[PDB]
Structure 1
Amino acid sequence: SMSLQVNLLNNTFANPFMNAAGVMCTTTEELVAMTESASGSLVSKSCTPALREGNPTPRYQALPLGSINSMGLPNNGFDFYLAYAAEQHDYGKKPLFLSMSGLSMRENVEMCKRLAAVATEKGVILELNLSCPNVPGKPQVAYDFDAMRQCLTAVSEVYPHSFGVKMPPYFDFAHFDAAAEILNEFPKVQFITCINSIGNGLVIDAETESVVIKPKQGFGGLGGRYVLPTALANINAFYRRCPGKLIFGCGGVYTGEDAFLHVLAGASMVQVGTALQEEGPSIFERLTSELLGVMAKKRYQTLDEFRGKVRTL
């Protein structure tokens, strides 16, 4: 009598779970493993026009309360992910998202021109990353509203399909309002993924009296338990301000209960990063089971019964 089914953008998803871009989605082996998993969908590693080796190691550290990273967009390059979407992915198993993270507006425009035909033919869906906080000297496009509007205009001009945007967290209603106003100008922006990491935290190991990652003097994006209330805030803020769009939640999901909170805040899909990095794709079997358990105890049969229904006081 229950279902985790999600229906959006002319697709049916068996459940709302997928990986967060960047986690377990860089290589062919990883993409196949995600496709064979119990997840409802998957997204490929944020790509640049050419391959990148990324930042020096160590560049990721798991922590009691989450994780810190400065990966620096290590990826196989756009051609590789385009080929996976065009020729290898089994769409009969689940829908596929492709994450794009060009290092300039022109880079994104040029990749989008080429992605267009594959989206048309095969149905891959674009998630445009406006938020990488780890490439040295590169600005957070989404923290620059003028730049964001220009980039979405440029992409919209050449990309004849719906797409979504991956956003960094905001921390002020003025910013939520400004960002929402811009996103609402673009009807092709049909979903907003909240959130990328909390940027530029600094973890210090008391025992070693040192930072724990090599790039950028130890500063890196935070994920995991640290970020859940910030993620819920951003999911709900955009759920409220962009009623014409769907929200994908990302941040702090370890359990079915955490997923329940994402959906209550407004999420349609729920992405899993840090927890997936630590547990592997088997996590999706556990999460679907747990979310159904939470729903059964609460007497909910479907996600639409409580999506966005968080009660205020």
Structure 2
Amino acid sequence: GSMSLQVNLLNNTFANPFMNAAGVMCTTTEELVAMTESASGSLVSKSCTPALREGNPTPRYQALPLGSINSMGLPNNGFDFYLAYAAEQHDYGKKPLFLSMSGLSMRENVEMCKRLAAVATEKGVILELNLSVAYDFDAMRQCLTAVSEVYPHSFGVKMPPYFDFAAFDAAAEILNEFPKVQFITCINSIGNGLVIDAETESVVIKPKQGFGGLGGRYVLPTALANINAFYRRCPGKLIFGCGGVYTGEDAFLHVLAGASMVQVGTALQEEGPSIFERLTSELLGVMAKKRYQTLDEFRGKVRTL
């Protein structure tokens, strides 16, 4: 039987649902080019601030048997750099491009969005706004109101994980007020875990006394929960999954929970962009064994008891 990983959304066609997670292998020109050349369906640029940032002292990332911990500190080449990539360099013939934005204040987001507008219009780059801010529902509302007010396009929002239905309801209520928010990416890292190495009797990253965001196998059930929670509560919007994807089977779970696109962080950091060839092959293999032809056939169809 004929089978396809194609995704159609945001006025774009994607060969497959896979892309990098913001922050992973998408900071430099070489990384952005490598992502574009890869088998991924899309890519997103490193979350940017108005000016270049060095980020936190090293070590600031550690791979772990069950995932990763990091406190990168937003090291990035600055907004001008990513805007120029989107405007002059990216080959839109190959795949669509998302640009991740993480201003350190409302003002910074407003000023960057005003400049992004023209490039989105002319080239088709799509904004993923990083709110992970989102544990303060008032700050989240203010951020979104400001961006919505000045940015004349649809966009998406990258969310931190929530852990109770009251939070899911409060966040969904806010997101649903903004028609321009067309996708929601669930999730950013599980915040402020602490990895201790028994051998060294020490933490494993330098910033913040060793506290850092968790990714990888640790976060998969939390990611699936958030994907599904917002899938249910925001029926007018698309959900992008992010968290714990190492295999085609993991990706299948994201889609079953409601994901349209599937982002890959920790596993990509460890394996490099060749991972996308493996993931597409594996996801097709999973669909073959389960007798599915397209993603629409099972997206959001997780069975409850």
Pair in the same fold by TM > 0.5: yes
1:87-106 per-position Cα deviation (integer Å, ceiling 9, x unaligned): 00000000000000000000
Looking at structure 1, the residues matched to 149 and 178 of structure 2 have their Cα atoms a distance apart, in angstroms, of 11
Looking at structure 2, the residues matched to 158 and 15 of structure 1 have their Cα atoms a distance apart, in angstroms, of 32
Aligned to 2:24: 23
In the TM superposition, residue 108 of structure 1 has moved relative to its aligned partner by 0.1
Looking at structure 1, the residues matched to 255 and 230 of structure 2 have their Cα atoms a distance apart, in angstroms, of 13
Aligned to 1:54: 55
Looking at structure 2, the residues matched to 151 and 204 of structure 1 have their Cα atoms a distance apart, in angstroms, of 35
In the TM superposition, residue 199 of structure 1 has moved relative to its aligned partner by 0.1
Looking at structure 2, the residues matched to 188 and 44 of structure 1 have their Cα atoms a distance apart, in angstroms, of 20
In the TM superposition, residue 111 of structure 1 has moved relative to its aligned partner by 0.1
Aligned to 1:252: 244
Q: Report SS of the residue matched to 1:142.
A: coil
Looking at structure 2, the residues matched to 231 and 166 of structure 1 have their Cα atoms a distance apart, in angstroms, of 12
Pairs aligned (count): 304
Looking at structure 2, the residues matched to 52 and 151 of structure 1 have their Cα atoms a distance apart, in angstroms, of 21
Uncovered stretches (5+) of structure 2, i.e. residues with no partner: none
Looking at structure 1, the residues matched to 204 and 37 of structure 2 have their Cα atoms a distance apart, in angstroms, of 33
The yes-or-no answer on 1:307 pairing with 2:299 is yes
Uncovered stretches (5+) of structure 1, i.e. residues with no partner: 132-140
Looking at structure 2, the residues matched to 85 and 298 of structure 1 have their Cα atoms a distance apart, in angstroms, of 38
In the TM superposition, residue 190 of structure 1 has moved relative to its aligned partner by 0.2
In the TM superposition, residue 265 of structure 1 has moved relative to its aligned partner by 0.1
Aligned to 1:167: 159
In the TM superposition, residue 171 of structure 1 has moved relative to its aligned partner by 0.1
Looking at structure 1, the residues matched to 252 and 148 of structure 2 have their Cα atoms a distance apart, in angstroms, of 33
In the TM superposition, residue 158 of structure 1 has moved relative to its aligned partner by 0.6
Looking at structure 1, the residues matched to 10 and 216 of structure 2 have their Cα atoms a distance apart, in angstroms, of 28
Aligned-pair identity (%): 100
Looking at structure 2, the residues matched to 193 and 23 of structure 1 have their Cα atoms a distance apart, in angstroms, of 15
TM-score, normalising length: structure 1: 0.97
Task: Select between 146-155 and 270-279 the one with higher mean Cα deviation.
Answer: 146-155
Q: Report SS of the residue matched to 1:46.
A: strand
Q: How does 1:208-223 map to 2 (within 5 A)?
A: 208-223=200-215
Looking at structure 2, the residues matched to 150 and 76 of structure 1 have their Cα atoms a distance apart, in angstroms, of 26
Looking at structure 1, the residues matched to 250 and 78 of structure 2 have their Cα atoms a distance apart, in angstroms, of 33
1:116-172 per-position Cα deviation (integer Å, ceiling 9, x unaligned): 0000000000000000xxxxxxxxx10011111111111011100000000000000
1:196-240 per-position Cα deviation (integer Å, ceiling 9, x unaligned): 000000000000000000000000000000000000000000000
Aligned to 1:7: 8
Q: How does 1:60-75 map to 2 (within 5 A)?
A: 60-75=61-76
TM-score, normalising length: structure 2: 1.00
1:277-307 per-position Cα deviation (integer Å, ceiling 9, x unaligned): 0000000000000000000000000000000
Looking at structure 1, the residues matched to 273 and 139 of structure 2 have their Cα atoms a distance apart, in angstroms, of 36
Looking at structure 2, the residues matched to 7 and 84 of structure 1 have their Cα atoms a distance apart, in angstroms, of 24
In the TM superposition, residue 274 of structure 1 has moved relative to its aligned partner by 0.1
1:32-91 per-position Cα deviation (integer Å, ceiling 9, x unaligned): 000000000000000000000000000000000000000000000000000000000000
Instruction: Name the Cα RMSD after superposition.
Output: 0.2
Looking at structure 2, the residues matched to 203 and 197 of structure 1 have their Cα atoms a distance apart, in angstroms, of 14
Q: Report SS of the residue matched to 2:263.
A: strand
Task: Select between 150-159 and 299-308 the one with higher mean Cα deviation.
Answer: 150-159
The yes-or-no answer on 1:197 pairing with 2:189 is yes
Q: Report SS of the residue matched to 1:67.
A: strand
